[PDB]
């Protein structure tokens, strides 16, 4: 029962497009997106078609302007719903060095500052043991977002990053 609606203008005005599960290209129906309503569930929305470019995570809610999903602009073209397992536990292992090496830290908690908590500004590999997580380039859940749907991540490119810069992360909780 999850649904997201994109609107071409701010404040939920103008032409709109509805997605119910995974839409690899709505650019043909909307040339821009300046407000979004997320009715149920959590969604990943993407700048370019086929889930490419900058990514933004939107939990349920109303977003009357693109700044409210921390967007860079009104350019969005594809989206997929974030499917969470039940159970309700979250666990991540973050590594100082590539290929699950160097200092390891394991945590079940949101981390708004990797520097203050783990004394690193970079993550070079990672194992998500339980749940679903977001990595952020900057502290306090700012900057480039990356979605980590469990499994193992040998190198930053495996979570979509061009570099190991990660400075906060948090769980996607329904």
Q: What are phi and psi of 147, to 5 degrees?
A: -100, 130
Choose one of 55, 84, 113: the last residue of a domain.
Answer: 84
Same domain (yes/no): 33, 61: yes
Structure tokens at 163: 């570099």
This structure was determined by: X-ray
User: Counting every residue, how long is the chain?
Assistant: 174
Counted domains in the chain: 2
Examine the domain organization and report whether 17 and 96 are in the same domain. no
Q: Are residues 174 and 89 in the same domain?
A: yes
Segments of 41-138 assigned E as strands: 43-48, 52-58, 61-63, 78-81, 91-97, 101-107, 125-130, 133-138
Site of tokens 């329904």: 174
Q: Strand 125-130 relative to strand 91-97: parallel, antiparallel, unpaired?
A: antiparallel
Residue of 54, 69, 42, 40 whose CA lies nearest to 131: 42
Residue 11 domain boundaries = 1-84
Q: Let me know whether 27 and 99 are in one domain.
A: no
């Amino acid at each position: 029962g999850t649904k997201i609606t994109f609107y071409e203008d701010k404040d939920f005005e103008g032409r709109r497009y509805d997605c119910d599960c995974d839409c690899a290209d709505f650019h043909t129906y909307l040339s821009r997106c300046n407000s979004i309503k997320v009715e149920g569930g959590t969604w990943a929305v993407y700048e370019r078609p086929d889930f490419a470019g900058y990514m933004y995570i939107l939990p349920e809610g109303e977003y009357p302007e693109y700044e409210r999903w921390m967007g860079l602009n009104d350019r969005l073209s594809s989206c997929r719903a974030v499917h969470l397992p039940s159970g309700g536990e979250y666990k991540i292992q973050i590594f100082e060095k590539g290929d699950f090496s160097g200092e390891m830290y394991e945590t079940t908690e949101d981390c708004p500052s990797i520097m203050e908590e783990f004394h690193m500004r970079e993550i070079h590999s990672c194992k998500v043991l339980e749940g679903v997580w977001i990595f952020y380039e900057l502290p306090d859940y700012r900057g480039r977002q990356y979605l980590l749907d469990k499994k193992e991540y040998r190198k930053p490119i495996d979570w979509g990053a061009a570099s190991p810069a990660v400075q906060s992360f948090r769980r996607i909780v329904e």
